Amino acid sequence: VRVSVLNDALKSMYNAEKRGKRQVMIRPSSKVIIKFLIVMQKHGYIGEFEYVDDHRSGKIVVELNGRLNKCGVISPRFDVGVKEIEGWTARLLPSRQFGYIVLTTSAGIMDHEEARRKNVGGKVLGFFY
Amino acid sequence: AEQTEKSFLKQPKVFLSTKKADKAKRPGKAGNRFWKSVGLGFKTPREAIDGTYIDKKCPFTGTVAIRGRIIAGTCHSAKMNRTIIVRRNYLHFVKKYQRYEKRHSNIPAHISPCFRVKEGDHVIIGQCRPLSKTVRFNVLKVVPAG
Amino acid sequence: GRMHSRGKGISSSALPYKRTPPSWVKTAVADVDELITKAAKKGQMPSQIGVLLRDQHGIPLVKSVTGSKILRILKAHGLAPEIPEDLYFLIKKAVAIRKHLERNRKDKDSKFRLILVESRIHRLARYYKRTKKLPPTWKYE
Amino acid sequence: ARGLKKHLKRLNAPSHWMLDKLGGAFAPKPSSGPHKARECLPLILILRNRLKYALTYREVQSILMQRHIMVDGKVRTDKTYPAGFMDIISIPKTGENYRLLYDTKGRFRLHSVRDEDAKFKLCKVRSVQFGQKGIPYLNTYDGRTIRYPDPLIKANDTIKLDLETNKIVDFIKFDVGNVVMVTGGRNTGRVGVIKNREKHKGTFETIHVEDAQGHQFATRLGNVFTIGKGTKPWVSLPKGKGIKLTIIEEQRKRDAAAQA
Amino acid sequence: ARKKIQKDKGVEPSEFEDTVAQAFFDLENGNQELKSDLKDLYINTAIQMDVVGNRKAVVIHVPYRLRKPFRKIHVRLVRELEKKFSGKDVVFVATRRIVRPPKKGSAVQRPRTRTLTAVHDGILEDVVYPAEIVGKRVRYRLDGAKVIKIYLDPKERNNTEYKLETFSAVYRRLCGKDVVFEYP
RNA sequence: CGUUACUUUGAAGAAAUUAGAGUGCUCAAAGCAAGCCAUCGCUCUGGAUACAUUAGCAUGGGAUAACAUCAUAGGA
Ligand SMILES: [K+]
Numbered sequence: 001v002r003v004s005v006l007n008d009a010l011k012s013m014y015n016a017e018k019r020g021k022r023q024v025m026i027r028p029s030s031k032v033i034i035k036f037l038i039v040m041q042k043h044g045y046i047g048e049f050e051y052v053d054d055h056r057s058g059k060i061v062v063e064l065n066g067r068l069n070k071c072g073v074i075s076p077r078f079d080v081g082v083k084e085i086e087g088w089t090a091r092l093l094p095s096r097q098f099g100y101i102v103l104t105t106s107a108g109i110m111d112h113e114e115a116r117r118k119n120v121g122g123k124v125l126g127f128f129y
Numbered sequence: 130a131e132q133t134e135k136s137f138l139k140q141p142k143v144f145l146s147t148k149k150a151d152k153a154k155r156p157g158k159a160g161n162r163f164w165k166s167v168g169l170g171f172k173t174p175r176e177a178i179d180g181t182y183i184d185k186k187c188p189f190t191g192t193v194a195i196r197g198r199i200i201a202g203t204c205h206s207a208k209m210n211r212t213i214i215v216r217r218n219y220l221h222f223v224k225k226y227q228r229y230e231k232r233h234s235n236i237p238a239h240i241s242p243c244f245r246v247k248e249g250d251h252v253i254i255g256q257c258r259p260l261s262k263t264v265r266f267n268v269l270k271v272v273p274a275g
Numbered sequence: 276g277r278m279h280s281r282g283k284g285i286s287s288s289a290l291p292y293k294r295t296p297p298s299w300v301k302t303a304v305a306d307v308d309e310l311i312t313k314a315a316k317k318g319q320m321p322s323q324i325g326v327l328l329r330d331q332h333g334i335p336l337v338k339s340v341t342g343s344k345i346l347r348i349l350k351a352h353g354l355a356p357e358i359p360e361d362l363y364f365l366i367k368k369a370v371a372i373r374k375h376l377e378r379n380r381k382d383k384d385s386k387f388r389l390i391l392v393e394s395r396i397h398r399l400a401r402y403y404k405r406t407k408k409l410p411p412t413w414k415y416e
Numbered sequence: 417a418r419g420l421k422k423h424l425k426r427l428n429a430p431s432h433w434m435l436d437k438l439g440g441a442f443a444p445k446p447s448s449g450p451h452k453a454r455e456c457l458p459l460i461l462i463l464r465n466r467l468k469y470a471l472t473y474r475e476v477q478s479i480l481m482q483r484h485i486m487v488d489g490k491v492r493t494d495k496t497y498p499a500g501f502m503d504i505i506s507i508p509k510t511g512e513n514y515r516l517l518y519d520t521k522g523r524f525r526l527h528s529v530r531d532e533d534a535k536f537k538l539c540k541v542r543s544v545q546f547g548q549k550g551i552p553y554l555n556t557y558d559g560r561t562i563r564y565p566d567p568l569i570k571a572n573d574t575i576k577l578d579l580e581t582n583k584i585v586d587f588i589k590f591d592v593g594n595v596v597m598v599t600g601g602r603n604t605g606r607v608g609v610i611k612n613r614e615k616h617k618g619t620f621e622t623i624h625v626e627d628a629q630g631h632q633f634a635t636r637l638g639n640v641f642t643i644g645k646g647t648k649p650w651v652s653l654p655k656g657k658g659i660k661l662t663i664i665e666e667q668r669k670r671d672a673a674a675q676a
Numbered sequence: 677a678r679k680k681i682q683k684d685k686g687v688e689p690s691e692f693e694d695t696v697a698q699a700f701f702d703l704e705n706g707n708q709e710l711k712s713d714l715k716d717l718y719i720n721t722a723i724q725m726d727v728v729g730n731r732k733a734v735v736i737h738v739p740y741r742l743r744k745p746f747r748k749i750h751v752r753l754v755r756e757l758e759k760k761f762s763g764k765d766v767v768f769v770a771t772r773r774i775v776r777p778p779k780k781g782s783a784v785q786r787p788r789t790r791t792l793t794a795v796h797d798g799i800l801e802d803v804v805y806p807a808e809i810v811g812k813r814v815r816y817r818l819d820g821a822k823v824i825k826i827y828l829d830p831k832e833r834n835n836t837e838y839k840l841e842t843f844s845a846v847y848r849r850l851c852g853k854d855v856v857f858e859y860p
Numbered sequence: 861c862g863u864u865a866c867u868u869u870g871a872a873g874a875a876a877u878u879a880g881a882g883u884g885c886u887c888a889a890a891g892c893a894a895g896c897c898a899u900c901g902c903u904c905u906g907g908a909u910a911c912a913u914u915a916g917c918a919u920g921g922g923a924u925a926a927c928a929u930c931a932u933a934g935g936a
């Protein structure tokens with residue numbers, strides 16, 4: 001069955017970006033996917049995205065700008081303290097200059113740099129670069 | 130009714146045959162049933178204050194004191210005389226695989242007649258002195274499953 | 276995926292986006308409610324009640340008009356079935372297959388399908404006991 | 417073991433003694449006395465390692481057997497006598513008096529005090545309860561029992577004891593806003609005022625202390641010692657004034673001193 | 677002269693609210709459809725706010741159980757009340773209770789009709805009641821703006837044609853969300 | 861007068877070992893010494909600090925997740 005809607009969203013976006021598509025439809029929609037997409041948009045890796053209300057689990061239509069190399073989830077959502085962010089970024093990011101690890105923290109869903117800025121740990125949702 | 134043993138069962142240091150009986154005095158005085166607050170924010174059940182049972186291992190009317198650990202759990206067995214098995218469920222972290230595994234601990238606890246419990250209830254136990262070979266805890270609060 | 280087969284069908288109904296009754300629906304709410312009560316009074320189950328209200332009356336969907344579901348309405352007026360309807364139908368299928376096997380011993384295929392049916396019965400009964408829509412000691416034999 | 421240990425291995429000695437690793441197989445095991453073995457400074461250490469009066473174990477014995485050293489006004493000849501926090505060490509031949517206080521690094525420092533200031537110590541009240549005959553009595557953490565104490569004195573209080581007369585001349589109630597010194601843990605030797613007391617039923621009680629420069633630290637009740645009523649301690653403090661410094665500021669001080 | 681409007685608790689009615697009450701009193705028995713239904717009419721609060729479309733708009737609150745009787749007379753009242761205050765697009769929105777989210781130290785069921793979302797969708801349905809919602813779309817712009825797009829029914833277009841900007845301003849103030857309207 | 865995981869901060873988690881501050885044992889492995897124009901003495905000389913799974917105690921946070929409920933609310 002659908003176990004992780006975030007994984008399906010990110011994998012569909014990755015496949016569409018590799019295919020050169022300028023729009024990708026995400027189904028189902030979820031608050032975590034909209035929160036991951038907001039981080040992605042804030043760092044400039046995607047453009048407009050549109051939540052389509054269908055009185056069910058929604059749909060998201062995302063504009064793609066060709067700036068994505070890869071986005072994926074980490075499953076399981078391992079507990080990541082502030083001190084283990086360095087090890088996680090070394091494991092998952094292409095360089096110490098670019099790339100983002102997305103964390104779910106009690107302070108909100110945020111990238112690892114913003115998590116360092118507030119000294120808040122949590123669980124890893126995924127990554128994009 | 131409570132005298133079910135080959136010996137009379139009395140609360141220690143309570144004089145039942147007192148001549149100057151009085152109900153306005155403190156527990157254990159003038160022949161009054163003795164009872165105590167265990168402390169640690171735990172209310173004394175009213176069936177212990179108004180009970181007729183004699184339990185020396187009761188936290189509220191007996192001689193035991195609650196000191197040390199306070200452990201929550203679930204009633205796993207209640208087939209013994211005034212003693213129940215408390216099952217504690219917890220996650221043991223496995224370092225190498227960064228995962229957890231489910232582990233359980235069976236803690237024998239003495240239960241006083243002021244509580245009636247059934248297998249599956251959520252109980253709160255407090256550490257006391259050794260009461261038997263395997264029992265070091267007393268039931269302090271019982272929350273039914275429903 | 277089908278729980279007990281490899282079939283991957285996706286045929287189903289699609290409720291309209293508009294959750295309010297269409298303007299052509301004029302039956303008063305109490306009217307549809309007492310119609311449901313009579314329907315359950317002969318012995319119809321909520322699925323059949325919905326089917327009849329859909330194809331023999333101007334009621335497309337009960338929830339849109341009244342604001343409640345058929346089983347909830349029947350529970351309010353004390354006409355809900357004791358055994359839930361899906362479990363009732365599964366038990367009916369199981370007893371039919373059991374009768375057939377009491378006449379036909381060599382039917383190993385029907386024995387396999389009976390095993391599947393009873394597996395479905397145990398699943399649904401476990402769920403209903405967990406949701407307290409069945410007696411805690413309700414047992415199928 | 418079949419009884420008490422008589423020897424202290426040098427590696428197993430308290431780390432605030434600053435004993436060196438290769439000085440021998442053994443450290444002076446503190447004798448039983450007013451202070452705990454793990455929280456005291458033995459007399460032999462004070463005389464040989466700290467004051468440099470003696471150079472050897474035997475020389476410490478020679479000094480002490482001359483009856484030259486008084487601890488809190490009384491002559492001690494035991495070398496492993498467990499001298500502890502706030503104890504007065506007086507040598508009435510050189511005319512010098514020392515109060516055993518903590519520096520901000522957790523190590524006992526012999527603080528020179530005036531002759532008048534060596535006439536009292538500060539003791540922390542451990543408990544107040546009725547003794548035999550129904551007589552109220554006080555006991556401290558430095559092993560003293562005082563009968564008929566002031567009824568306003570409770571546990572965890574600080575009493576001022578006149579060594580000459582052996583009576584409570586004044587006392588401080590353990591309240592929020594009193595300057596304190598931490599005597600145990602990682603904040604040993606830190607001085608600040610109590611801001612609040614967080615109590616938890618059945619477990620240790622946490623005290624929140626803020627020093628003069630504004631740094632905040634927390635420690636258990638058993639590691640807090642009141643030293644003054646308000647923001648003015650009753651005793652004189654070592655040069656650090658109980659203000660712990662980070663290693664960066666210590667390096668700043670060292671650089672400034674070397675530059676000068 | 678103090679009957680049509682009733683503050684939830686005994687609050688002083690703002691002067692504009694008393695003007696609306698006086699208009700209601702003078703419109704009680706004006707017409708045949710103006711009476712026989714205005715008897716069971718009660719208003720909580722009326723406020724007036726300017727809109728970008730150079731006109732002004734007034735909202736009307738409702739105790740939420742006469743809401744439908746209000747809907748049945750909504751079109752006619754909207755006409756009459758607007759005639760009472762020409763240039764003031766009148767909107768009739770019920771009153772719903774938004775409750776704080778339950779804490780971990782609480783076991784309250786917190787009816788989902790009392791949550792902020794369901795309240796806002798009910799409000800947006802009430803504020804454009806002459807039209808019906810066919811579709812809802814939400815755009816997340818680069819600067820973080822969350823602009824909501826609602827598709828109204830193609831029928832009743834002219835009945836809800838020039839109220840679009842006033843509806844946007846009303847939902848901006850009383851709910852706090854950017855909103856645009858389109859027609860399929 | 862719902863818990864728990866999770867995370868944050870704090871207190872603990874011996875010393876020695878490890879990492880690491882200072883220090884010219886001639887260097888170094890070390891050690892915890894020492895240094896000062898030379899001083900009947902002085903530098904209050906120094907003798908830091910970090911780390912320390914898991915489990916336990918306490919503080920803040922509630923996104924994620926687990927368990928328990930979840931129309932006799934029959935609520936107040
Ligand atoms: K079908």
Ligand SMILES: [K+]
Nearest residue numbers: 417418419420
């Ligand atoms: K032994």
